Amino acid sequence: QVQLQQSGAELVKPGASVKLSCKASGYTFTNYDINWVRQRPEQGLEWIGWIFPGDGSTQYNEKFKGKATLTTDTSSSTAYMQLSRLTSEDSAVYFCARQTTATWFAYWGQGTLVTVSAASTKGPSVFPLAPGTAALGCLVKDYFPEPVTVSWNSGALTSGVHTFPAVLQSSGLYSLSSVVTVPSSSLGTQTYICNVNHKPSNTKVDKRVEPKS
């Protein structure tokens, strides 16, 4: 039941700070270290440092020292990483990971996306795409920042689904597509609802997609 749950995505003004969180479960939090790893967009893994929640002893990678700070909280079984004076280059996904014994990590968190920008958060617009096989979907347009989660029929519909990576528009906003192929005869019987969630703007939208006329 070894579970590492990281805090939600972040948007950060340059020069400001953010404290990411990693909560542990399924094991005795006190015993094993917790490492932090950064993955910049379309790139590889860079190590940041570790911390022993048993006492609080930490050692860092030291290009991340005037940048990263690691703490723990035994009473809540949670590790934290404060990122200070952030630059647009610090925009990345930040993973936490539990060592068991040595330098290898069999257990990772899901990762936390951090976007460094002066821009404000804007919720998306959800538009219907609408069509033996038929295709339909949702256009999740003009939001900031990443990410957005998209599911169909509250998760009940996964087969035939394709959620495409968002593209960055000239406006400075993201636009995303999510489609699903279904038989055309079901367009009258079955209802189709794409479930869009953009937590940076706290926006949850359920859009039913229909043929017109």
């Binding site: 190590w47 993973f95 990772w108 538009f127 096989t133 295709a135 959620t163 495409f164 597509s177 192929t181």
Partner: protein, 213 residues
């Protein structure tokens, strides 16, 4: 320092083949090398700890090799589900470091795309903007050409594109393209079309619609 170096950045293989992925530790690290698999939108997964030691739960076809500096990750008989990026990691000397990654592609028989075109929603049109979306579904190889035509006027620079990660089951790709126009521009034309060229198509495929029809 230390530097891990894996070297083919990308690799395309047939299911059933044997795959060897190299990792050059720029300093003797004995059997202290670690392999990770990261699939799209996922945290890394430990495949092999210490050069060649097994990891519980990991399929038997995965194995490690090497010592000192040069290392090898091997997949016995590769499966479609082995698509993804493969990282190696220094497990000997801090600062812990990662190789740049080798992305693995899975070959399959050529599959032509299914093409679908979607008109702008009246809901979006009210906002003064019109997005037209062209869907290319389940094709191989990845190389595909999407051409937007408006009243036989070739469109360039006013569209954005986005391809999915290779499917873990059928090894196909899907592509989504959005042609964006102003409300004014959109209503001043009739025939909107996306032209698709692909190795699986004997001749280009065109899907279209007349605005307001």
């Amino acid at each position: 320092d230390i530097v891990m170096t894996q070297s083919p950045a990308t690799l395309s293989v047939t299911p059933g083949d044997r795959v060897s992925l190299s990792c050059r530790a720029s300093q003797s690290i004995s059997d202290y090398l670690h392999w990770y698999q990261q699939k799209s939108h996922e945290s890394p997964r430990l495949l092999i700890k210490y050069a060649s030691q097994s990891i519980s739960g990991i399929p038997s076809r995965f194995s490690g090799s090497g010592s000192g500096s040069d290392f090898t990750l091997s997949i016995n008989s590769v499966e479609p589900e082995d698509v993804g990026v493969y990282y190696c990691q220094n497990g000997h000397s801090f600062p812990l470091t990662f190789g740049a990654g080798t992305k693995l592609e899975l070959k399959r028989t050529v599959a032509a795309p299914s093409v679908f075109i979607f008109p702008p929603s009246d809901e979006q049109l009210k906002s003064g903007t019109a997005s037209v979306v062209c869907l290319l579904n389940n094709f191989y190889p990845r190389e595909a050409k999407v051409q937007w035509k408006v009243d036989n006027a070739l469109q360039s620079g006013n569209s954005q594109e986005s391809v999915t990660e290779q499917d873990s089951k059928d090894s196909t790709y899907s592509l989504s393209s959005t042609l964006t126009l102003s409300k004014a521009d959109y209503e001043k034309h009739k025939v909107y079309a996306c032209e698709v060229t692909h190795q699986g198509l004997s001749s280009p495929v065109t899907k279209s619609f007349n605005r307001g029809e």
